[PDB]
């Protein structure tokens, strides 16, 4: 008996987790009450694990010891090119053990990939069964489209450590049409999956033909997502801080950390509110921050990386050998789909068509993994 069996979008920055639960596609809050957590994983000094959001907002001097982004390494070999450009920018050691890429930190360990997306894989596992009351053995897990073989095969793995069985490994791009209800369609659709996550930018043109789907072509930026848009005003902030005080705060972790926090949180309420205040009590060298931030301002720090996700779109169309009109539907995935200013270029795009968003971006591909789990439950 398989159980009950779980569906969990396993991403490069969060992660979300669903399940039917009596009758009903349920997307699961942890006990924090977020709905999605980070893929984030943190080693103390005094040695307990942190995991998820108790690990992505510790303060710490040494952030060295904070894995995150784990997904980047799974399932490649030491001199894949991604792996050797990624160990350049990566904030924490990642080290070659027998021709691969482990992560070193002090607790010192060594951790294979799939060991850190097990980590993650089993506070999801947790999250699920707090909420169902009862044991999760078994799993389907989402992976990107371009993922090959041995990355596929890498995050079963990550399952199997974590105490999963991970039945099927799924494309994310069709897991977010599974959710809209797109499977479940007499006849033939061209799907745009444009989905902007907190370090990636994936997008896919998917073709549905009665239940059937072929991801036809897919591009996007590997480097490119949320995180980008608050570093942008990150740095608008640590200048404009250097400016009025002349302190550069780049010297202290920690304050750095503060200040992301903040400028995350800000930019959340930007997407509902037109302007956001960030407040730091003892900010650096115990002196007090507080500044606000317009929604203009933040749309015009980023003007360029939002404008440059439409190269990707004409790329994957090209490729495709379809037009604009040819497009059916778009999904947006991704709570950075939630910026209006990146919905409305969107749909500019597609001169005014208007792009599904009536499921949570940030929670559409756990939703469509649990649609095919809810299948395979005992
Ligand atoms: N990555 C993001 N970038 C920009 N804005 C975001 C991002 N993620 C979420 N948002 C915005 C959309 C909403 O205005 C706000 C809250 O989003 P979310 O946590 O998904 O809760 P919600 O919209 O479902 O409401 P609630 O949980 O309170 O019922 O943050």
Known sequence: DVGTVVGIDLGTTYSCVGVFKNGRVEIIANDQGNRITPSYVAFTPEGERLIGDAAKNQLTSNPENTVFDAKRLIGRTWNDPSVQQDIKFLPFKVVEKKTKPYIQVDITKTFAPEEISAMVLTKMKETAEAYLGKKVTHAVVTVPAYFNDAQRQATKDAGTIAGLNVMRIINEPTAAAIAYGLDKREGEKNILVFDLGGGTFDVSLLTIDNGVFEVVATNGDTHLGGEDFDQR??????????????????????????????????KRALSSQHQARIEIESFYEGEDFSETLTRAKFEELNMDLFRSTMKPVQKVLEDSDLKKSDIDEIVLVGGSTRIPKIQQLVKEFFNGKEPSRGINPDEAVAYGAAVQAGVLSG
Do not use: P, W
């Not at 404009?240 to 949180?265: F, H, I, M, S």
């Open 233 to 266: 005003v990150m740095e608008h902030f640590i200048k404009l801080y250097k400016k009025k005080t002349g302190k550069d705060v780049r010297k202290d972790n920690r304050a750095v950390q503060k200040l992301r926090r903040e400028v995350e949180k800000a």
